[PDB]
A paper describes a structure:
The coronavirus SARS-CoV-2 protects its RNA from being recognized by host immune responses by methylation of its 5’ end, also known as capping.
Crystallization experiments were conducted for the three NSP10 variants but only T102I variant yielded protein crystals. The structure was determined by molecular replacement and refined to allow comparison with wild-type NSP10. The only observable difference was the loss of a water bridge interaction between the hydroxyl group in the side chain of T102 and a water molecule. The observed TM values for all three variants T12I, T102I, and A104V were 41.3 ± 0.1°C, 44.0 ± 0.1°C, and 44.9 ± 0.1°C, systematically lower than the TM value for native NSP10 (47.4 ± 0.0°C). In summary, this signifies that the three variants have only marginal effects on the NSP10 binding affinity to NSP14 and NSP16 and show either the same or slightly improved affinities for complex formation.
Numbering used by the authors: 7 to 130
Amino acid sequence: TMGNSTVLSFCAFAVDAAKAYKDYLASGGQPITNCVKMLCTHTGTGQAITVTPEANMDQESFGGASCCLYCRCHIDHPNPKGFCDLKGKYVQIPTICANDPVGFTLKNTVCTVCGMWKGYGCSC
Ligand SMILES: [Cl-]
Ligand SMILES: [Cl-]
Ligand SMILES: [Cl-]
Ligand SMILES: [Zn+2]
Ligand SMILES: [Zn+2]
């Protein structure tokens, strides 16, 4: 197992950091650790990204920036305005995937309707 700094550096300087992290994970690499876990009641709304921790009974809440590959790699976010949708907020991760919050936020998308993760919490 490589070390967070080794993994993050490798992704940070790749032309496509997300691809590099996804390909590492698919090869069996250990997920990036030391994300900031929140203590919370687990009777929250279950929404994916919120101003305060909102985990329901099936989720864990994390500090948003600590689960953001771009934030963890100190690089720009892959959009024009460069705004980060996780920084300063709290991200709800299904506990099944809580061993890899960085990879989870990367791969998934918040349902525009119910504000929950598509394919997990989203029951639309
Ligand atoms: Cl390391
Ligand atoms: Cl700890
Ligand atoms: Cl969810
Ligand atoms: Zn970020
Ligand atoms: Zn939905």
